[PDB]
Design a protein around this ligand. Structure first.
Ligand SMILES: Nc1nc2c(ncn2[C@@H]2O[C@H](COP(=O)(O)OP(=O)(O)CP(=O)(O)O)[C@@H](O)[C@H]2O)c(=O)[nH]1
Ligand SMILES: [Ca+2]
Ligand SMILES: [Ca+2]
Length: 297
């Protein structure tokens, strides 16, 4: 993800090299080019306009027009604007004494495999996780998480067909007490679209289990639809943070860039492969530097 945009931002910056100091009109040209690059990456007009305005202000504050290397000033101000757009400071969930967390999202989002890779990440950090396969319609969606829990050495509780939220709560509390579980990761059901009985069911489970966090797992390769999905889940269920998967995929990147400010939720993790190990903390500085061709490729 972000190939064309990364190329197009780098090319805009590169066009400023070797020319001496630049003029006001030269700066305006570069700024429209950044705005176009963003919009071609599917950033909407308002977010792209805000981004460019930030770059303009910052670059003028660094006296870009008086620099012998204006490309470097633009690189720095684009970098920072990208970092800020992606969230600024890296963030994660608060771990406290009791940690019960929902993973929500659509079919194909990376939800179930993210649950398992999350289980493993936290086990490696000294937590003691329990995975809950919470689709009460589909034995095979539950199964799938079972075999991923075995892979990663993290225990699993599968809900029964049609199980009530109160029984789930009981069986989960019983197992958590018996097994000393101190991070319960609830893999809510995945469908192809927003199943409305689905959203209601999920809201009821949420009222009953009272999760500390509700993590919505979004496939980055699906585009602007992701931010509509985010709004829908936040309004029908209520979500506390994001995970963006398939950032290793080939796709534009503009919605991901816009997600922090559009959804108002932190991005805690990004999935970077199909493997259990392929989910790591989301580091706004790292994707931003990367996008601009700095650091480790
Ligand atoms: N390349 C890549 N593939 C991913 C990533 N996360 C998940 N996938 C893949 O996406 C597909 C969908 O996974 P997932 O959504 O977890 O399972 P599912 O079978 O659709 C069930 P649900 O969506 O309800 O969790 C799987 O093939 C999985 O390997 C990622 O970060 N990168
Ligand atoms: Ca209710
Ligand atoms: Ca280098």
């Amino acid at each position: 993800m972000f190939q064309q945009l990364s190329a197009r931002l780098q090319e805009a910056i590169g066009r400023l090299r070797g020319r001496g100091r630049i003029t006001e009109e030269d700066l305006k040209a570069t700024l429209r080019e950044i705005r176009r690059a963003l919009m071609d990456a599917d950033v909407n007009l308002e977010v792209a306009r805000d981004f460019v305005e930030r770059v303009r202000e910052e670059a003028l504050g660094k006296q870009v027009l008086e620099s012998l290397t204006p490309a470097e000033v633009i690189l720095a101000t684009v970098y920072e604007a990208l970092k800020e757009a992606l969230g600024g400071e890296a963030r994660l969930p608060v771990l406290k004494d009791r940690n019960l967390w929902f993973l929500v999202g659509l079919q194909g989002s990376g939800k179930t495999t993210t649950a398992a890779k999350l289980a493993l990440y936290y086990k490696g950090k000294g937590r003691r996780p329990l995975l809950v396969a919470a689709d009460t319609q589909r034995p095979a969606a539950r199964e799938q998480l079972r075999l991923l829990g075995e892979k990663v050495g993290v225990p699993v509780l599968e809900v029964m067909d049609g199980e009530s939220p109160e029984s789930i709560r009981r069986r989960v509390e019983e197992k958590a007490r018996l097994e000393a579980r101190d991070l319960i990761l609830v893999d809510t059901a995945g469908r192809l679209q927003i199943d409305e009985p689905l959203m209601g069911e999920l809201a009821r489970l949420k009222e009953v289990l009272g999760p500390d966090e509700v993590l919505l797992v979004l496939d980055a390769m699906t585009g602007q639809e992701a931010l509509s999905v985010a709004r829908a889940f936040d309004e029908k269920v209520g979500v506390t943070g994001l995970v963006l998967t398939k950032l290793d995929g080939d796709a534009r990147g503009g919605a991901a860039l816009s997600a922090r400010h559009v959804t108002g939720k932190p991005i805690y993790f990004a999935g970077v492969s199909e493997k259990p190990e392929g989910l790591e903390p989301f580091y706004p500085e790292r994707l931003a530097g990367r996008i601009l061709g700095m650091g480790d490729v």
